[PDB]
Design a protein around this ligand. Sequence first.
Ligand SMILES: Nc1ncnc2c1ncn2[C@@H]1O[C@H](COP(=O)(O)OP(=O)(O)O)[C@@H](O)[C@H]1O
Ligand SMILES: [Mg+2]
Length: 71
Amino acid sequence: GKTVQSISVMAYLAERYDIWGPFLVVAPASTLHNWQQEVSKFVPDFKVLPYWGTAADRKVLRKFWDRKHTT
DNA sequence: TAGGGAGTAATCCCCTTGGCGGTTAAAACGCGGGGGACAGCGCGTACGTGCGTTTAAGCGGTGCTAGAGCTTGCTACGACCAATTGAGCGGCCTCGGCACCGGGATTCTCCA
Ligand SMILES: Nc1ncnc2c1ncn2[C@@H]1O[C@H](COP(=O)(O)OP(=O)(O)O)[C@@H](O)[C@H]1O
Ligand SMILES: [Mg+2]
């Protein structure tokens, strides 16, 4: 499980350094809904942005990008 | 000898076309009547034809000088490019202009 090891890094950055992102996961498109479920399973506290869709749906999702906070 | 171009097919985002459903507003259909199209008529005046006059346009001829058209010389200036930045484009935001509605007031029509 390379997925769950990597997620446990972000959970360590959260648990140890209070870094709750922003965290970017890039994956192949067939992986997206899978990894979304995987991160939801392994770490329920991470709010996940499922950034895919037609242009208008992504344009709505960009409203969630906070540029003010680096952590 | 190697690099990057040619071939090709899978991958995945963008976007234009087409269908479904309603519903609703605009196109289609009817018909009376009116008034405007249009033919037919009278007159008169205004425009084409003709003749004598004149006027000046057009052709042949002379003389002049301006200025179009060309050659020469040079330097000013705009093409050129490498370095620098700030004006202006693309994305995001919000509030106020304007439209759309409703109902009461003034205008305009048309028949008496
Ligand atoms: N520590 C674990 N506990 C339970 N299941 C795990 C653990 N680590 C991995 N898995 C399971 O392994 C399966 C495949 O793991 P995954 O990380 O998706 O493989 P990959 O390395 O190809 O990403 C997933 O279904 C995941 O749930
Ligand atoms: Mg994986």
